[PDB]
Structures are given as structure tokens and as C-alpha cells.
CSV table of C-alpha atoms in Angstrom, one decimal:
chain,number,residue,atom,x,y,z
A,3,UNK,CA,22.3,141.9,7.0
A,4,UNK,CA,19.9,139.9,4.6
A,5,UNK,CA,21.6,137.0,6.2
A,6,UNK,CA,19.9,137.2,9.6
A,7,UNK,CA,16.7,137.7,7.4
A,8,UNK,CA,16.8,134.2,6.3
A,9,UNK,CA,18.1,132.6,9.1
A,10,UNK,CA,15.2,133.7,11.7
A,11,UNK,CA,12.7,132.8,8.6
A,12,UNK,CA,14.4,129.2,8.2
A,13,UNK,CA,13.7,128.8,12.3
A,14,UNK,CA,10.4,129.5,12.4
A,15,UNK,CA,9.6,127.4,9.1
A,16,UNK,CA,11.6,124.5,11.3
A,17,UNK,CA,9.2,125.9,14.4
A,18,UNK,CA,6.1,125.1,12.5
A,19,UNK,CA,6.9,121.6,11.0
A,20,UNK,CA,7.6,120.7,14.9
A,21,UNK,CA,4.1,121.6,15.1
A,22,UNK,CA,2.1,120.4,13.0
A,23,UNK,CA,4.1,116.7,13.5
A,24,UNK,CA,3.1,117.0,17.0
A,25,UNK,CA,-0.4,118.6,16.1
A,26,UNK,CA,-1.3,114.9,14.8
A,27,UNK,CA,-1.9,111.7,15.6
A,35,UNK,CA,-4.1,111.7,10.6
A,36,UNK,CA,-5.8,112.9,13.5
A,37,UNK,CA,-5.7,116.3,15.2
A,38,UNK,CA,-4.9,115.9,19.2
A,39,UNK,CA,-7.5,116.6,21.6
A,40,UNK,CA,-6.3,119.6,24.3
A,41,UNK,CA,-5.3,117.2,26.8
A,42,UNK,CA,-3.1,115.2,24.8
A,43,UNK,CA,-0.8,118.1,24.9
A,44,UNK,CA,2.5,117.3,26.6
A,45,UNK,CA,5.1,119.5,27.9
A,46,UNK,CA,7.5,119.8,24.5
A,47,UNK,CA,4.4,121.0,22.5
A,48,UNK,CA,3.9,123.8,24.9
A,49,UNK,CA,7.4,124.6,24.8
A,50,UNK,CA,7.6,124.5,21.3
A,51,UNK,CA,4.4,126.3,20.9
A,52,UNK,CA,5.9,128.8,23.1
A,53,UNK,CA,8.8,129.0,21.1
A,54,UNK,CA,7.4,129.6,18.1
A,55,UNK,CA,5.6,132.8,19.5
A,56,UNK,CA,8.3,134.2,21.1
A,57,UNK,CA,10.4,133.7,17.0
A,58,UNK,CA,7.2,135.5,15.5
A,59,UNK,CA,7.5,138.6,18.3
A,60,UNK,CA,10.8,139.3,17.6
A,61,UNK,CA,10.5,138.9,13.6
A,62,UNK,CA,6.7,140.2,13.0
A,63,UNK,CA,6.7,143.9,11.5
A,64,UNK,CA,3.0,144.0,11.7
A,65,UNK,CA,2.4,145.1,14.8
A,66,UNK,CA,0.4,142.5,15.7
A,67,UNK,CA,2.0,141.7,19.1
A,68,UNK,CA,4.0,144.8,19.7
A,69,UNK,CA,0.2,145.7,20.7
A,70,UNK,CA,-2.2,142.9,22.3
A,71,UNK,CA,-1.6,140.0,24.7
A,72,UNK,CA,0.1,137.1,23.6
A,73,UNK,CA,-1.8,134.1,24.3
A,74,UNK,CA,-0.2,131.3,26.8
A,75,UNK,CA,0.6,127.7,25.3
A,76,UNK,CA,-3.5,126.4,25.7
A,77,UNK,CA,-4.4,129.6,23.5
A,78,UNK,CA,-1.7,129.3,20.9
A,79,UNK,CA,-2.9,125.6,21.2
A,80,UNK,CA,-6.6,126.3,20.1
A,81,UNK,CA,-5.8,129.1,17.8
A,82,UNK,CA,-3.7,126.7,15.6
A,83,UNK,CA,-6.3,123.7,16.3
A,84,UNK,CA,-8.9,126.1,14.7
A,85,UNK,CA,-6.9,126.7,11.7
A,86,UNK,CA,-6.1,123.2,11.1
A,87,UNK,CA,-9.7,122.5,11.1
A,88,UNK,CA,-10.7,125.7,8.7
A,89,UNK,CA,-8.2,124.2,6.6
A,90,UNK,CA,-8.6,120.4,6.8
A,91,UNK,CA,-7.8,120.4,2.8
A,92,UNK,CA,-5.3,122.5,2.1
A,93,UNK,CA,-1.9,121.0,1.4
A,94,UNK,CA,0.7,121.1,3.9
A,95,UNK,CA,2.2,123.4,2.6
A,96,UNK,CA,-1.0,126.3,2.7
A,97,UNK,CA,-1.4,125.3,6.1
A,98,UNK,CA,2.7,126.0,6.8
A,99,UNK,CA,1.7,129.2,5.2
A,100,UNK,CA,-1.6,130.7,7.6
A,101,UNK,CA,1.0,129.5,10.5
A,102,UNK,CA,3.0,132.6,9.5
A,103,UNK,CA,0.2,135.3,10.9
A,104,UNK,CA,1.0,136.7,14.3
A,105,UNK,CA,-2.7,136.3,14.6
A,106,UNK,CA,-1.8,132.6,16.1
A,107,UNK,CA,0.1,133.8,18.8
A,108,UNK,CA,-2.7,136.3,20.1
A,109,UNK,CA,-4.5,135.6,23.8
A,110,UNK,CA,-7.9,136.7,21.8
A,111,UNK,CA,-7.4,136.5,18.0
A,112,UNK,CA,-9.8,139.1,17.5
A,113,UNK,CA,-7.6,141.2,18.7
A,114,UNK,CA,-6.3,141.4,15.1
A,115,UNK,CA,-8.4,143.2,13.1
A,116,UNK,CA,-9.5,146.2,15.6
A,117,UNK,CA,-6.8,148.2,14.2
A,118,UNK,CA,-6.6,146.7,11.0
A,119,UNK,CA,-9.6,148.5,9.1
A,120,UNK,CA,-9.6,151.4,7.5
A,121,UNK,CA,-13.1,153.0,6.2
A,122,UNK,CA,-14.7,155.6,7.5
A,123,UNK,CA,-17.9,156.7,4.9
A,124,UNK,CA,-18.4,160.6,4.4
A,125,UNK,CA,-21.6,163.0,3.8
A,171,UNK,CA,-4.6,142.0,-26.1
A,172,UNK,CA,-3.4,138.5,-24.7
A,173,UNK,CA,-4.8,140.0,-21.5
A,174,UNK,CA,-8.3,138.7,-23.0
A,175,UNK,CA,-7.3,135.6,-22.3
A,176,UNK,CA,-7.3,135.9,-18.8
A,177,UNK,CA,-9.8,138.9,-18.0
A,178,UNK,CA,-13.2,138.9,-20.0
A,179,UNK,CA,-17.1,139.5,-19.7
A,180,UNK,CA,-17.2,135.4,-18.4
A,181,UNK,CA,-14.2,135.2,-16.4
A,182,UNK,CA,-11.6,137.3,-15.0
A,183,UNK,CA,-8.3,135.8,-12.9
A,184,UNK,CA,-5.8,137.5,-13.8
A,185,UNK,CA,-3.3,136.3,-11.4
A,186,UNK,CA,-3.2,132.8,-13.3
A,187,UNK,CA,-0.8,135.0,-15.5
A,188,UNK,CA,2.3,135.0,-14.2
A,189,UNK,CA,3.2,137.4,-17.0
A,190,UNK,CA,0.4,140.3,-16.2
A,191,UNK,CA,1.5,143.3,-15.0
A,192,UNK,CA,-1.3,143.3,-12.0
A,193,UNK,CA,-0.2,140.0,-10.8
A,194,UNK,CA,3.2,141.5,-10.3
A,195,UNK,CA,1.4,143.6,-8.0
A,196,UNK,CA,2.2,141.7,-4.3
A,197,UNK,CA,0.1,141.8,-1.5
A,198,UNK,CA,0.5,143.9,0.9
A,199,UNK,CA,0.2,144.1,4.5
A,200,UNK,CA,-1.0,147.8,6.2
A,201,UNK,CA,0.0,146.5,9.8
A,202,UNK,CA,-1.9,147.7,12.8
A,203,UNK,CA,-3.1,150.7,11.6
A,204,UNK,CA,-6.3,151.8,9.9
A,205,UNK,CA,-5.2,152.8,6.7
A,206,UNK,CA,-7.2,150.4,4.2
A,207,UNK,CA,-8.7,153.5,2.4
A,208,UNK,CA,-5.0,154.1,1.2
A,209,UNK,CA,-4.1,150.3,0.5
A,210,UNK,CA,-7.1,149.3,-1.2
A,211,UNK,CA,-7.2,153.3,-3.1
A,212,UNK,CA,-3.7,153.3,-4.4
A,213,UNK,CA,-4.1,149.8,-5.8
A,214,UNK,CA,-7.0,150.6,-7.6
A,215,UNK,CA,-4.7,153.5,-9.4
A,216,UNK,CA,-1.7,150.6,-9.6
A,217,UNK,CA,-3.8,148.7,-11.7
A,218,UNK,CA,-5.1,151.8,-14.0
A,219,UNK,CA,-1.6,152.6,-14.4
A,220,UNK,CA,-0.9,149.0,-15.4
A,221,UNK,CA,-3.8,148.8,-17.9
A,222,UNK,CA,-1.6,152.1,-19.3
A,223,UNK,CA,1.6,150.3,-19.9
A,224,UNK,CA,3.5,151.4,-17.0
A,225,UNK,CA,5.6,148.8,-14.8
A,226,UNK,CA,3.9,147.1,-11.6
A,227,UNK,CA,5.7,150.1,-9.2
A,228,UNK,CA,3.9,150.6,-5.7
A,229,UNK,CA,3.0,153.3,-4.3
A,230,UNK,CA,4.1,154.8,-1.2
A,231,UNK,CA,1.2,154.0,1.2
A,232,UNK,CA,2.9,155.8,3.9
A,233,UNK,CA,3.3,159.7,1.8
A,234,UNK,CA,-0.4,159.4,1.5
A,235,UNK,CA,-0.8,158.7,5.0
A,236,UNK,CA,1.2,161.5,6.3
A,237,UNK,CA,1.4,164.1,4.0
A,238,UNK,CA,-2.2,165.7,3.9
A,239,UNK,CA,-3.8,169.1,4.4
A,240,UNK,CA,-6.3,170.4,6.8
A,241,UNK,CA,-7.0,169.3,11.1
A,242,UNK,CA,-4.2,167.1,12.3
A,243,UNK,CA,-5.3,164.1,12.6
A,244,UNK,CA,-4.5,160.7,14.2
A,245,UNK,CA,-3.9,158.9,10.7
A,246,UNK,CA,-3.0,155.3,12.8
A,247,UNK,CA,-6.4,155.3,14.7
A,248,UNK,CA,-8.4,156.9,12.2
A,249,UNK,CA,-9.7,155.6,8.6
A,250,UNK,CA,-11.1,157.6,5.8
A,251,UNK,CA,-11.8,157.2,2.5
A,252,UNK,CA,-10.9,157.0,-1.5
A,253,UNK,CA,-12.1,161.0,-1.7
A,254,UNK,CA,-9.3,161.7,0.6
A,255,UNK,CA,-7.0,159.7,-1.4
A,256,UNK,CA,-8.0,161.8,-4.5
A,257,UNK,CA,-8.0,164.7,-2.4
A,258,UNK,CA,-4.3,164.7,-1.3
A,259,UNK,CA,-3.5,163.7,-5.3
A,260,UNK,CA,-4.6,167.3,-6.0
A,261,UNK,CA,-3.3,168.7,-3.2
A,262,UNK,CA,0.1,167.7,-3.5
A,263,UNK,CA,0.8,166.6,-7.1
A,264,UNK,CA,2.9,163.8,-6.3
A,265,UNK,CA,3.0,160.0,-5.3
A,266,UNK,CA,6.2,158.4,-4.5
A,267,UNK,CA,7.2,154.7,-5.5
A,268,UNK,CA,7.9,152.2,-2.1
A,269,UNK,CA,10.9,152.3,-2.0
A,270,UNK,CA,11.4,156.0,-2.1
A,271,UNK,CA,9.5,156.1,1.0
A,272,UNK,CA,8.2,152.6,2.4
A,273,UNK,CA,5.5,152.0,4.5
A,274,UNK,CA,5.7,150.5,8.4
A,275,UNK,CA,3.0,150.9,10.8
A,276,UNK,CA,5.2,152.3,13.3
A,277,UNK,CA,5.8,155.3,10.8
A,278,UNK,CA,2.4,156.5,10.1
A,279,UNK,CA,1.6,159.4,11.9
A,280,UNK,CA,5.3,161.0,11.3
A,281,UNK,CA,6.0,164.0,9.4
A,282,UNK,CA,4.8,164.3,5.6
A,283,UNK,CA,9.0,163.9,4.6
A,284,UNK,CA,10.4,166.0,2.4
A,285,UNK,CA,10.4,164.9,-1.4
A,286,UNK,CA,13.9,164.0,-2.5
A,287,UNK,CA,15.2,164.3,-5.7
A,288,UNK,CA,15.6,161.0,-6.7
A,289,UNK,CA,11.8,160.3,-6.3
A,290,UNK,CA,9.9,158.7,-8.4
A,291,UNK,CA,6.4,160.5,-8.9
A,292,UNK,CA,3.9,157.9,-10.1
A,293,UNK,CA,1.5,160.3,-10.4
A,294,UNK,CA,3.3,162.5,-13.2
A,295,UNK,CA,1.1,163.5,-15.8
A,296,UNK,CA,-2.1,162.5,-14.3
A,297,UNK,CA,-5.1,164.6,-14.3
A,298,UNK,CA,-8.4,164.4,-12.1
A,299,UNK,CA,-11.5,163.9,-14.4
A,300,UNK,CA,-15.1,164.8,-13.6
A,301,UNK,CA,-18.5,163.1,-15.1
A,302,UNK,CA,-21.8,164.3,-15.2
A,303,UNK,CA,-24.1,163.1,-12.2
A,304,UNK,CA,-26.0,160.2,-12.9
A,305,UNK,CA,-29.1,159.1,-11.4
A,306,UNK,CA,-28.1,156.0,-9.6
A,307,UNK,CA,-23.9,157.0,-9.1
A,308,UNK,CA,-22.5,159.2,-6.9
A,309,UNK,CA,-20.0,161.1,-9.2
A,310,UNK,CA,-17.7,163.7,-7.8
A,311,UNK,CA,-14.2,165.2,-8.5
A,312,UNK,CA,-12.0,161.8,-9.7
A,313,UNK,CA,-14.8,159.1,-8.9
A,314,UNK,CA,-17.7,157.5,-9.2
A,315,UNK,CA,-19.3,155.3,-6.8
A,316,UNK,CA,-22.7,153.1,-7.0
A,317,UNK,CA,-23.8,151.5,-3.9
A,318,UNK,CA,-25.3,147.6,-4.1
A,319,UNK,CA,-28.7,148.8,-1.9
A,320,UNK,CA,-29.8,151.3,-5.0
A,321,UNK,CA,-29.3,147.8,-6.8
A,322,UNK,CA,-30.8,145.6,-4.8
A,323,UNK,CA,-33.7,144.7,-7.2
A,324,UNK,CA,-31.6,145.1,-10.4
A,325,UNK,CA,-28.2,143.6,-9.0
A,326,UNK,CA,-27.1,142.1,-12.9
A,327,UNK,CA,-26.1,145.4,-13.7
A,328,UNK,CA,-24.9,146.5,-10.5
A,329,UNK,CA,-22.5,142.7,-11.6
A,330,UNK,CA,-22.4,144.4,-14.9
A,331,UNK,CA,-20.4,147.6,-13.9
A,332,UNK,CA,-18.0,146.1,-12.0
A,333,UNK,CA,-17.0,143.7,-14.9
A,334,UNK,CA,-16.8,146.4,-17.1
A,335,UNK,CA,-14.5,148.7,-14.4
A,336,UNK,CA,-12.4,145.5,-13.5
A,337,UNK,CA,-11.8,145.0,-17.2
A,338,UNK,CA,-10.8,148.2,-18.1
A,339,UNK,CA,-9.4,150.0,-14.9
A,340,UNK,CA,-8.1,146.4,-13.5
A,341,UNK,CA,-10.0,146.8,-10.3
A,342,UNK,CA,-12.6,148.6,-8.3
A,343,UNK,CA,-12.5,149.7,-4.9
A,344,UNK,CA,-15.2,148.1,-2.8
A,345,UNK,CA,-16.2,148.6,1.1
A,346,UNK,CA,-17.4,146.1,2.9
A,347,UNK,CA,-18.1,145.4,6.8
A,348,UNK,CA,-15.2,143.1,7.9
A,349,UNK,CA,-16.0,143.7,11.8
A,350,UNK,CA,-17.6,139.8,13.0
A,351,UNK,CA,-17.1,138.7,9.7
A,352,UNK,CA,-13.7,137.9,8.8
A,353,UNK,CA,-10.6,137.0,11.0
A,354,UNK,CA,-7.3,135.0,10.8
A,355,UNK,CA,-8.7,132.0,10.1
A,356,UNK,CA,-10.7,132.8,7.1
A,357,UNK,CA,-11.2,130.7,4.2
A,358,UNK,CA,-9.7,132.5,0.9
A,359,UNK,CA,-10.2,128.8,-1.6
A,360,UNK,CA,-14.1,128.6,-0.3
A,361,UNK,CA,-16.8,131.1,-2.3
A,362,UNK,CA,-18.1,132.7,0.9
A,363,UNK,CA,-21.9,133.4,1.0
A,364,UNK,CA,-22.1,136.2,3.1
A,365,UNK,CA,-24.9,139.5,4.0
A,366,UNK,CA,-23.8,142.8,4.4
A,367,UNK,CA,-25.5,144.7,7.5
A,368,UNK,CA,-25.9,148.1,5.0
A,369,UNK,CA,-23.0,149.4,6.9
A,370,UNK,CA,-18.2,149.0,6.3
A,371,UNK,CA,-15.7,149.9,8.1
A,372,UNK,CA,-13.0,148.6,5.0
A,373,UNK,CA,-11.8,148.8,2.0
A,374,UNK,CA,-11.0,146.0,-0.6
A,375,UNK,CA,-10.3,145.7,-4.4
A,376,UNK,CA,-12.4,143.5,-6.6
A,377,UNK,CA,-9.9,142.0,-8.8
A,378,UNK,CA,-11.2,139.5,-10.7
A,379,UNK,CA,-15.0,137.1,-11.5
A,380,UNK,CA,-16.0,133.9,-12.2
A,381,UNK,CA,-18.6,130.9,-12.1
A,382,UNK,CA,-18.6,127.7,-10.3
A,383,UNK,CA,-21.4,125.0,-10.0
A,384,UNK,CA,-21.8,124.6,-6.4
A,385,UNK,CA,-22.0,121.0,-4.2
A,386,UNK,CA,-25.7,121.3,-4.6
A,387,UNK,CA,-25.6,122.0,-8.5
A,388,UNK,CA,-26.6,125.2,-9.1
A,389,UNK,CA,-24.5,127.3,-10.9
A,390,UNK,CA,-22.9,130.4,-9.0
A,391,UNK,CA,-20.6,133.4,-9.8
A,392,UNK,CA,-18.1,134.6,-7.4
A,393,UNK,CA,-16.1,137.8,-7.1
A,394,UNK,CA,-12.4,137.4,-6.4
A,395,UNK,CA,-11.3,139.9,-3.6
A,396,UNK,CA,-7.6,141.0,-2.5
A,397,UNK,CA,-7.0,142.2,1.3
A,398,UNK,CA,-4.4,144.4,2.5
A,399,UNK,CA,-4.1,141.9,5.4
A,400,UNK,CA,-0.7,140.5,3.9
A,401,UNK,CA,0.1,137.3,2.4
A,402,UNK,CA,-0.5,134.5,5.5
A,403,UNK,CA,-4.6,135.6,5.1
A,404,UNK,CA,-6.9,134.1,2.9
A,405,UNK,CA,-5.9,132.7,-0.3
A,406,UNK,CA,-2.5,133.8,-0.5
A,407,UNK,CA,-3.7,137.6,1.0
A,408,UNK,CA,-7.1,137.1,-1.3
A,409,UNK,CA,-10.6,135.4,-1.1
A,410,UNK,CA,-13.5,134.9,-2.8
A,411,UNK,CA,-17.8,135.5,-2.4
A,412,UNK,CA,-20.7,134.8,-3.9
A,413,UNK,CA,-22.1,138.3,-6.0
A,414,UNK,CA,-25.5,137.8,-4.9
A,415,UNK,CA,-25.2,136.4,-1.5
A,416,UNK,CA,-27.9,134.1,0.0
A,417,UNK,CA,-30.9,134.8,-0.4
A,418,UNK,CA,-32.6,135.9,3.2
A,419,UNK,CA,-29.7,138.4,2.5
A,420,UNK,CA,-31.2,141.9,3.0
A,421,UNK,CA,-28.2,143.6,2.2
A,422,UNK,CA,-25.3,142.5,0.1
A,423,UNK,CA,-21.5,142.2,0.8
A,424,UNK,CA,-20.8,144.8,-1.0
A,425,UNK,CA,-21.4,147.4,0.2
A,426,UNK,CA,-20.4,150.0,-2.5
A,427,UNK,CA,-17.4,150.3,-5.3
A,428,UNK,CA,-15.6,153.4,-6.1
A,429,UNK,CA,-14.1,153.7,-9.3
A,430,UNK,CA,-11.6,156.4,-9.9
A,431,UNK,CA,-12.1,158.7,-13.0
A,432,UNK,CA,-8.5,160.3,-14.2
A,433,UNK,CA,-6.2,160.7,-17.2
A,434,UNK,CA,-2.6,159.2,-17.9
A,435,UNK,CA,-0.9,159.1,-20.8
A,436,UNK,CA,0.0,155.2,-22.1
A,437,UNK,CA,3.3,154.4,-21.7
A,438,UNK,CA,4.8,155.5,-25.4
């Protein structure tokens, strides 16, 4: 029951404050000042997290012995010398920590594959964080955690049409991630292995006129790759009444059936109004879709508070939503603008499942970050 739920949850929180009290000195230990009830404690802990994590993490790649799970956790700590404990009790809840090589977590946990009123208050042309609204519709939208498949093009695709239909009035009601997944036409395919894209998002839209809620059909790892299920009658179709719009070509989009895209390179000598777009479609639409290159880049024990200053390499392998904007005035005093990023990576990554990088990127950056966004063109009706 629910009961067990909590119980294995209130062990492992108990699990990591053992920890960390032994993980100190405040000063962290060095590797040889680790004695015998750290490493079974540490031990412990990863053997709680197997039998608990639904992510796939390590159902699928080596768990690390007690010196691994030592340094993995020591590297956190040190990523992370300022956040509260409590922030730090939180990344200690990624199965990452228990991996032999924690880069084991992300091979499977991509996605992309490229083809060929008050609400002003919290989202505007300056500044855009619309999570500090407890209230907002899109910030009722919880992270979510695609497991060990590649299956960001869905995550990061149907939140981008979560938030349209939130700008339209409608509640904050997922989408099954896991229909899209295995309901599609065409070549089977191995949809676990595999990413794609949001034109094969849009595609299976068409194709089968409907989109369950979560709960009508919820998403595990485990499950992708089974049978598109029959739709029951009790479904919910969150895609009632929608239609797939179409705009004229322009010269530097891509514009097909349901989206338009613009990529940052055909931008990278006029990159304020490649900025400029995005506020716009994160205003209006309450996100875009971006890909980026997560392979090298990002991993478990990623800062999400920090405005990373990253390059692109002109290539991704994920997808991400741009959720939200804003300027800060760095160490150095210059003043900078950040986007704000969600992950489908779950909640125990980044800032709460979210980070946040610098629009413009250094500036020996040949390429930029973002790599491209993709905004989706349809029609709902508003809520009454």
C-alpha cells in the first residue's frame, strides 16, 4: 500500500543524514578517513535506492562499490558547497550516486534525433519566472522523469503543448508520455533506444486524434516499447478540439505542418532577435522547445542555481523547454541575461529538475547552446 511508500522513503532520508554526518569533519573527509560504518552505510544506502528507484538507473549499469559511491557523493558535496542542507539531502536522491561510472546515466537518457492578466506579473518582456507563482497553472506542471529511455522528444514536446493549453485556461493535466511513445504509425521501431523529434510528436497528433491524461495511461520506462493500448472509455483526450495550423515559410524559420523552428547558427550575428522570439513564444505559448547537446556537458552533478556559460558544438542529441528569462549582474559586474531551462531528468537534477545559462554564451563560443527552438503552431479553443 501507500504505506510502504513512505516508509522505504523515511529510510533512505534517515540513510542520507547518516551520511552526510559522517561525510564531515565543516570539513569534507579525505578518502582515507573512511571507516568501516561509512562503507556500510554507504552500501546501505544503494542497496535502499535499488530496490525503490523506478528510473531504471540501476536495473541497467553497475553499481559502484563503497570507494565509488564515496567519490560520487564527495563530488556533489563539493558542486554544492552552498546549498542548504536540505538541497544537498535532495541531489542524494538520484540513483546516479550509486553508479560504478556516473556517466553511465545519461547514455539512455536523451532523446533527439534531428531529421532532413496577473500572469504579467510574473512573465514579461524583462523577466519571466513563472514558477515563483505558486498559483500559475504551468508551475502546477511537476517535473518529470523519462527514466532510461530516450524519449526527451516526447517529454520536452508534450510540455510545450501543457503549457499552450494552460495559457488557454485548461487545468495543469499531463499528458501520457507513454501513448505517444507507443502508439505510432509506420516501421516498428525500438522507441526505448531510439529518439526522434517534435515532428513526430505532431505527427502521431494527426495520426491518431487523441492524447490521453497520466493517469489514464502513465508512463514507466519499463513500458515503452509495449503495445499502443487500446483507448478506454473513461479517457480523457487532451487533445479534443485541437487543430494543426500551418504558416507561410519564412526566410530564416523552418515552418512546416504544426511548427516552426529557427536555429541559433542562422542568428549568430543577430542573436537579440533570435532572444527576442523566444520571449515572445515563452510569453504567449508558456514555453518553447529547444535542443541542445547534453552528451560531455551535463551529468548528475550539475549545477541548476549557477547561470552556466556554455558553447554548443552545432550539433543535440536532447530536448528541453525554455521556460522562463531573466538578468543578473555577474561577480565581475557586468550585467547578464539567463534563460531558465526545465529537464525531463526528474526532480533530484539541477535546480529542483531545472537549470539555468547564459543566452549568449562566452564569447570564443562558436556555436551557441541552443541549438534550435521549435515552437508548435495549433488551435484550441479557451476554456469557456
Amino acid at each position: 500500500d501507500d504505506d510502504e511508500d513512505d516508509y522505504t522513503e523515511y529510510k533512505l532520508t534517515e540513510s542520507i543524514d547518516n551520511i552526510l554526518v559522517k561525510m564531515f569533519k565543516s570539513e569534507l573527509i579525505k578518502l582515507e578517513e573512511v571507516d568501516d560504518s561509512l562503507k556500510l552505510e554507504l552500501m546501505n544506502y544503494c542497496s535502499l535506492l535499488k530496490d525503490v528507484d523506478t528510473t531504471g538507473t540501476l536495473d541497467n549499469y553497475g553499481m559502484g562499490n563503497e570507494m565509488d559511491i564515496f567519490n560520487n557523493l564527495k563530488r556533489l558535496l563539493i558542486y554544492h558547497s552552498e546549498e542548504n542542507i536540505n538541497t544537498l539531502k535532495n541531489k542524494f536522491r538520484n540513483a546516479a550516486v550509486c553508479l560504478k561510472n556516473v556517466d553511465d546515466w545519461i547514455v539512455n537518457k536523451r532523446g533527439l534525433v534531428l531529421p532532413e492578466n496577473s500572469d504579467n506579473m510574473f512573465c514579461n518582456k524583462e523577466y519571466c519566472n513563472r514558477l515563483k507563482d505558486e498559483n500559475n497553472c504551468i508551475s502546477n506542471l511537476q517535473v518529470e522523469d523519462q527514466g532510461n529511455c530516450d524519449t526527451s522528444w516526447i517529454f520536452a514536446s508534450k510540455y510545450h503543448l501543457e503549457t499552450i493549453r494552460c495559457m488557454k485556461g485548461y487545468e495543469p493535466t499531463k499528458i501520457s508520455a507513454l501513448y505517444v511513445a507507443n502508439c505510432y504509425k509506420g516501421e516498428h521501431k525500438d522507441r526505448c533506444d531510439e529518439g526522434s523529434s517534435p515532428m513526430e510528436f505532431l505527427q502521431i497528433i494527426e495520426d491518431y486524434g487523441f492524447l490521453p491524461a497520466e493517469s489514464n495511461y502513465p508512463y514507466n520506462y519499463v513500458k515503452v516499447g509495449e503495445q499502443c493500448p487500446k483507448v478506454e472509455d473513461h479517457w480523457m483526450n487532451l487533445w479534443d478540439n485541437g487543430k494543426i495550423l500551418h504558416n507561410k515559410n519564412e526566410p530564416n524559420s523552418l515552418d512546416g505542418k504544426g511548427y516552426t523552428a529557427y536555429e541559433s547558427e542562422r542568428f549568430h550575428d543577430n542573436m537579440d532577435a533570435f532572444v527576442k522570439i523566444i520571449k515572445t513564444e515563452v510569453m504567449n505559448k508558456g514555453s518553447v522547445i529547444a535542443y541542445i547537446k547534453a552528451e560531455n556537458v551535463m551529468g548528475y552533478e550539475f549545477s541548476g542555481k549557477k547561470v552556466q556559460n556554455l558553447c554548443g558544438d552545432d550539433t543535440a542529441d536532447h530536448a528541453v523547454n525554455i521556460v522562463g528569462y531573466g538578468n543578473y549582474v555577474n561577480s565581475e559586474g557586468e550585467k547578464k541575461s539567463y534563460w531558465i531551462v526545465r529537464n525531463s531528468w526528474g526532480p533530484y537534477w539541477g535546480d529542483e529538475g531545472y537549470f539555468k545559462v547564459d543566452m549568449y554564451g562566452p564569447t570564443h563560443c562558436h556555436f551557441n547552446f541552443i541549438h534550435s527552438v521549435v515552437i508548435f503552431n495549433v488551435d484550441l479553443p479557451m476554456n469557456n
